[PDB]
Amino acid sequence: DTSVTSRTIKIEQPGRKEPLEIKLDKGDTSMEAIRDAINDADSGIAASIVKV
Amino acid sequence: AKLNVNGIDIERQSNTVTDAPQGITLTLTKKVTDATVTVTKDDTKAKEAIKSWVDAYNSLVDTFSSLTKYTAVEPGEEASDKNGALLGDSVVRTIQTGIRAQFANSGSNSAFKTMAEIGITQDGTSGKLKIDDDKLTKVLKDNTAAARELLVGDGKETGITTKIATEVKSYLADDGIIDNAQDNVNATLKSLTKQYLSVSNSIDETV
Amino acid sequence: VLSQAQAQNSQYALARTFATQKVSLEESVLSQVTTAIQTAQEKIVYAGNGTLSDDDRASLATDLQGIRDQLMNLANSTDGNGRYIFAGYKTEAAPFDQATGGYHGGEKSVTQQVDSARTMVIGHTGAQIFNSITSNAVPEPDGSDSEKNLFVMLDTAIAALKTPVEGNNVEKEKAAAAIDKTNRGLKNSLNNVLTVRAELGTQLSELSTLDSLGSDRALGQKL
Amino acid sequence: LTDLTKNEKGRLTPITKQQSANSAKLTAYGTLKSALEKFQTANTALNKADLF
């Protein structure tokens, strides 16, 4: 959404003790921005973009 | 061309598929069933770049020390003995101080605040950099993002390498300590050449 | 009368050569002082991390102790003739103690006449290269008073570092404040060392060239 | 005339020594710039992020 300014992605796994939090600013709703956010955290979860 | 990668259907116009997933180029030769492509991370390129950077720095420090090489004379007679060289010049002092100041990073988001954690440390007496391969390899394997954002950083104004490059470029480009040094010493050379011509004229007049 | 005036200029020239050798040794020792100070700054920045184990801080403390050992060894360096370059006016007296590091040489700065016309402080007191703080540098916010000696700065640093500060919020805060003030004190000390090199460097570069030019002018005036 | 030329050479001895020192300084600056540019090449080779 355009209105929100702070965003969090919470990922819970059975093997992971404390759920992972991914932080997104206001201007990072772009798909490339989400990929970079999820990759840069280096939590073991890899995000990618596939053009069908 | 029609293929299927991890349950996603891909259709292309050629036998070189490149954007599924982005960053993998596949060359198709014949129809295949359930092939496996494994991509694993390698850190050889980064370690080679770091090693070459350290070697270049060590060579630079050797040259800098040679320009300051001095030989003490026990009785007190004065001779060349390579003692003079470039002693007392503020240029070498400024260059070394700037580089060593840049060794301490500013505004690094990573936990590491210096180059010791990555594994490059300097002997106190020698003042030259040396690395430990095992710790460096382990750090590259575990936290590559932290090392990248420490050394490369944002690539513009944050990180050890970019700050070193910025200050070195400032020195070399114009009015920088080494470039201003070259300009000022060239003006000094012109004045000294005029002085040598004047000395030749004085020799002619006296003789 | 050529021989006598030439001998006078030659004895001033011998004083100049001894001064140049002394200040060249000063340049070498001060360069090794600069390399050590930079290593100490790197070590303190490593210690600047918020969280560390007891082993890490103990290793940092022993490395800093080694750095101080090298630094005083350079400060207590003996010249080839057996004198101490940084002793001051009296060469025979030891410049610094191994433990306290106090200045035992002549307080009055040694005055060597490079020429009859020009007289200045050629040799510097051994204190100045550790025991002087410039005013142009930014003051340390923690305290108005800044202890002059370079030794006592990093000694206070190791004093804060050696004591296990974990477990008490007030003690962690005091350790952090001590580390902050000691690192900015290291920066101020490095500024002082750089200024000392600039003054000494001019003496053995532009002033030494000035001495050579004055000798040439005296030769021309005699001629 | 030989004594006058000898005295002129004696006066030039600081001057010619300074000339040789200036030539040595220029060669030192050339070598230092070569080493500094080699180091700049190595640094910029490190500055690329795709290695990580």
Side-chain angles (χ1 to χ4, degrees), chain B residues 48-88:
Chain B
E48 301 314 281
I50 297 169
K51 283 173 32 205
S52 300
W53 183 77
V54 159
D55 182 40
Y57 185 44
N58 290 356
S59 174
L60 184 58
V61 173
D62 290 351
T63 299
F64 268 118
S65 300
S66 80
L67 297 188
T68 58
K69 192 66 179 62
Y70 172 71
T71 57
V73 179
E74 174 76 30
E77 287 94 9
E78 182 63 37
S80 305
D81 299 345
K82 300 158 300 179
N83 63 7
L86 203 56
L87 272 170

Coordinates of all heavy atoms in Angstrom, one line a residue, chain B residues 48-88:
Chain B
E48 N 41.0 -13.8 -2.9 CA 42.1 -13.3 -3.8 C 42.2 -11.8 -3.9 O 43.3 -11.3 -3.9 CB 41.9 -14.0 -5.2 CG 41.8 -15.5 -5.2 CD 42.9 -16.1 -4.4 OE1 44.1 -16.2 -4.9 OE2 42.6 -16.5 -3.3
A49 N 41.0 -11.1 -4.0 CA 41.1 -9.7 -4.1 C 41.7 -9.1 -2.8 O 42.5 -8.2 -2.8 CB 39.7 -9.1 -4.3
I50 N 41.3 -9.6 -1.6 CA 41.8 -9.2 -0.4 C 43.3 -9.4 -0.3 O 44.1 -8.6 0.2 CB 41.0 -9.8 0.8 CG1 39.6 -9.4 0.8 CG2 41.7 -9.4 2.1 CD1 38.7 -10.2 1.7
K51 N 43.7 -10.6 -0.7 CA 45.2 -10.9 -0.6 C 46.0 -10.0 -1.5 O 47.0 -9.5 -1.1 CB 45.4 -12.4 -1.0 CG 45.0 -13.4 0.1 CD 45.1 -14.8 -0.4 CE 46.2 -15.0 -1.5 NZ 45.9 -16.1 -2.4
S52 N 45.5 -9.7 -2.7 CA 46.2 -8.8 -3.6 C 46.2 -7.4 -3.1 O 47.2 -6.7 -3.2 CB 45.6 -8.9 -5.0 OG 45.7 -10.2 -5.6
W53 N 45.1 -7.0 -2.4 CA 45.1 -5.7 -1.8 C 46.1 -5.6 -0.7 O 46.8 -4.6 -0.6 CB 43.7 -5.4 -1.3 CG 43.5 -4.1 -0.7 CD1 43.3 -2.9 -1.4 CD2 43.3 -3.8 0.7 NE1 43.1 -1.9 -0.5 CE2 43.1 -2.4 0.8 CE3 43.3 -4.5 1.9 CZ2 42.9 -1.7 2.0 CZ3 43.2 -3.9 3.1 CH2 43.0 -2.5 3.1
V54 N 46.2 -6.6 0.1 CA 47.2 -6.6 1.2 C 48.6 -6.6 0.7 O 49.5 -5.9 1.2 CB 46.9 -7.9 2.1 CG1 48.2 -8.2 2.9 CG2 45.8 -7.6 3.1
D55 N 48.9 -7.4 -0.4 CA 50.2 -7.4 -0.9 C 50.6 -6.1 -1.5 O 51.7 -5.6 -1.3 CB 50.3 -8.5 -2.0 CG 51.6 -8.6 -2.7 OD1 52.6 -8.5 -1.9 OD2 51.7 -8.7 -3.9
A56 N 49.6 -5.4 -2.2 CA 49.9 -4.1 -2.7 C 50.2 -3.1 -1.6 O 51.1 -2.2 -1.7 CB 48.7 -3.6 -3.6
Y57 N 49.4 -3.2 -0.5 CA 49.7 -2.3 0.7 C 51.0 -2.5 1.3 O 51.7 -1.6 1.6 CB 48.6 -2.5 1.7 CG 48.8 -1.5 2.9 CD1 49.1 -0.2 2.6 CD2 48.7 -1.9 4.2 CE1 49.2 0.7 3.6 CE2 48.9 -1.0 5.2 CZ 49.1 0.3 4.9 OH 49.3 1.2 5.9
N58 N 51.4 -3.8 1.4 CA 52.7 -4.1 1.9 C 53.9 -3.6 1.1 O 54.9 -3.1 1.6 CB 52.9 -5.6 2.1 CG 52.0 -6.2 3.2 OD1 51.3 -5.4 3.9 ND2 52.0 -7.5 3.4
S59 N 53.7 -3.7 -0.3 CA 54.7 -3.2 -1.2 C 54.8 -1.6 -1.0 O 55.9 -1.0 -1.0 CB 54.4 -3.5 -2.6 OG 55.3 -2.9 -3.5
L60 N 53.6 -1.0 -0.9 CA 53.6 0.5 -0.7 C 54.3 0.9 0.6 O 55.0 1.8 0.6 CB 52.2 1.0 -0.7 CG 52.0 2.5 -0.6 CD1 52.8 3.1 -1.8 CD2 50.6 2.9 -0.6
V61 N 54.1 0.1 1.6 CA 54.7 0.4 2.9 C 56.2 0.2 2.8 O 57.0 0.9 3.4 CB 54.1 -0.4 4.1 CG1 54.8 -0.2 5.4 CG2 52.6 0.0 4.3
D62 N 56.6 -0.8 2.1 CA 58.1 -1.1 1.9 C 58.7 0.1 1.2 O 59.8 0.6 1.6 CB 58.3 -2.3 1.1 CG 58.0 -3.6 1.9 OD1 57.7 -3.5 3.2 OD2 58.0 -4.7 1.4
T63 N 58.1 0.6 0.1 CA 58.6 1.8 -0.6 C 58.6 3.0 0.3 O 59.6 3.8 0.3 CB 57.8 2.0 -1.8 OG1 57.9 0.9 -2.7 CG2 58.3 3.3 -2.5
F64 N 57.5 3.2 1.1 CA 57.5 4.4 2.0 C 58.6 4.3 3.1 O 59.2 5.4 3.4 CB 56.1 4.4 2.7 CG 55.1 5.3 2.0 CD1 53.9 4.7 1.5 CD2 55.3 6.6 1.8 CE1 53.0 5.5 0.8 CE2 54.4 7.4 1.1 CZ 53.2 6.8 0.6
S65 N 58.9 3.1 3.6 CA 59.9 3.0 4.6 C 61.3 3.2 3.9 O 62.2 3.8 4.5 CB 59.9 1.6 5.3 OG 58.6 1.5 5.9
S66 N 61.4 2.7 2.7 CA 62.7 2.9 1.9 C 63.0 4.4 1.7 O 64.1 4.9 1.8 CB 62.7 2.2 0.6 OG 62.0 2.9 -0.4
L67 N 61.9 5.2 1.4 CA 62.1 6.6 1.2 C 62.5 7.3 2.5 O 63.1 8.4 2.5 CB 60.8 7.3 0.7 CG 60.4 6.8 -0.7 CD1 59.3 7.6 -1.3 CD2 61.6 6.8 -1.7
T68 N 62.2 6.7 3.7 CA 62.6 7.2 5.0 C 63.8 6.4 5.6 O 64.1 6.5 6.7 CB 61.5 7.2 6.0 OG1 61.0 5.8 6.1 CG2 60.4 8.1 5.5
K69 N 64.5 5.6 4.8 CA 65.6 4.8 5.2 C 66.7 5.7 5.7 O 67.1 6.7 5.0 CB 66.1 3.8 4.2 CG 67.1 2.8 4.7 CD 66.4 1.8 5.6 CE 67.4 0.8 6.1 NZ 68.6 1.3 6.9
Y70 N 67.3 5.4 6.9 CA 68.3 6.3 7.5 C 69.4 5.3 8.1 O 69.1 4.3 8.6 CB 67.8 7.2 8.5 CG 68.9 8.0 9.3 CD1 69.6 8.9 8.7 CD2 69.1 7.7 10.6 CE1 70.6 9.6 9.4 CE2 70.1 8.4 11.3 CZ 70.8 9.3 10.7 OH 71.8 10.0 11.4
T71 N 70.7 5.8 7.9 CA 71.8 5.0 8.5 C 72.5 5.9 9.5 O 73.0 6.9 9.2 CB 72.7 4.6 7.4 OG1 73.2 5.7 6.6 CG2 72.0 3.6 6.4
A72 N 72.6 5.4 10.7 CA 73.3 6.1 11.8 C 74.8 5.9 11.7 O 75.3 4.8 11.3 CB 72.8 5.6 13.2
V73 N 75.5 7.0 11.9 CA 77.0 6.9 11.9 C 77.5 7.1 13.3 O 77.3 8.1 14.0 CB 77.6 8.1 11.0 CG1 79.1 8.1 11.0 CG2 77.0 8.0 9.6
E74 N 78.2 6.0 13.8 CA 78.8 6.0 15.1 C 79.8 7.1 15.3 O 79.7 7.9 16.3 CB 79.4 4.7 15.4 CG 80.1 4.6 16.8 CD 79.1 4.5 18.0 OE1 78.0 4.0 17.8 OE2 79.5 5.0 19.0
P75 N 80.9 7.3 14.5 CA 81.8 8.4 14.8 C 81.3 9.8 14.5 O 81.6 10.7 15.3 CB 83.0 8.1 13.9 CG 82.8 6.7 13.5 CD 81.3 6.5 13.4
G76 N 80.4 9.9 13.5 CA 79.8 11.2 13.2 C 80.1 11.8 11.9 O 79.6 12.9 11.6
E77 N 80.9 11.1 11.1 CA 81.2 11.6 9.7 C 79.9 11.5 8.9 O 79.1 10.6 9.0 CB 82.3 10.8 9.1 CG 83.7 11.2 9.6 CD 84.1 10.2 10.7 OE1 83.4 9.2 10.9 OE2 85.1 10.5 11.4
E78 N 79.7 12.5 8.0 CA 78.5 12.6 7.2 C 78.8 12.1 5.7 O 79.7 12.6 5.1 CB 78.0 14.0 7.1 CG 76.7 14.2 6.3 CD 75.5 13.4 6.9 OE1 75.4 13.4 8.2 OE2 74.7 12.9 6.1
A79 N 78.1 11.1 5.3 CA 78.2 10.6 3.9 C 76.8 10.3 3.4 O 75.8 10.3 4.2 CB 79.0 9.4 3.8
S80 N 76.6 10.1 2.1 CA 75.3 9.7 1.5 C 74.7 8.5 2.2 O 73.7 8.6 2.9 CB 75.5 9.6 0.0 OG 76.1 10.7 -0.6
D81 N 75.3 7.3 2.0 CA 75.0 6.1 2.6 C 73.5 5.8 2.6 O 72.9 5.1 3.4 CB 75.5 6.1 4.1 CG 77.0 6.2 4.2 OD1 77.6 6.0 3.2 OD2 77.5 6.5 5.3
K82 N 72.8 6.4 1.6 CA 71.3 6.3 1.4 C 70.6 6.8 2.6 O 69.4 6.5 2.8 CB 70.9 4.9 1.1 CG 71.4 4.3 -0.2 CD 71.4 2.8 -0.2 CE 72.2 2.2 1.0 NZ 72.2 0.8 1.1
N83 N 71.2 7.6 3.5 CA 70.5 8.1 4.7 C 69.5 9.2 4.5 O 68.4 9.2 5.1 CB 71.5 8.5 5.8 CG 72.4 9.7 5.4 OD1 72.1 10.3 4.3 ND2 73.4 10.0 6.1
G84 N 69.8 10.1 3.5 CA 68.9 11.2 3.3 C 67.6 10.8 2.7 O 66.6 10.9 3.4
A85 N 67.6 10.3 1.5 CA 66.4 9.9 0.8 C 65.3 10.9 0.8 O 65.6 12.1 0.4 CB 66.0 8.5 1.3
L86 N 64.2 10.6 1.4 CA 63.1 11.6 1.5 C 62.7 11.9 3.0 O 61.5 12.0 3.3 CB 61.9 11.1 0.8 CG 60.8 12.1 0.3 CD1 61.5 13.1 -0.6 CD2 59.7 11.4 -0.5
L87 N 63.7 12.1 3.8 CA 63.5 12.3 5.2 C 62.9 13.7 5.4 O 63.3 14.7 4.8 CB 64.7 12.1 6.1 CG 65.0 10.7 6.6 CD1 66.3 10.5 7.1 CD2 63.9 10.3 7.6
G88 N 62.0 13.9 6.4 CA 61.4 15.2 6.7 C 60.3 15.6 5.8 O 59.8 16.7 6.0

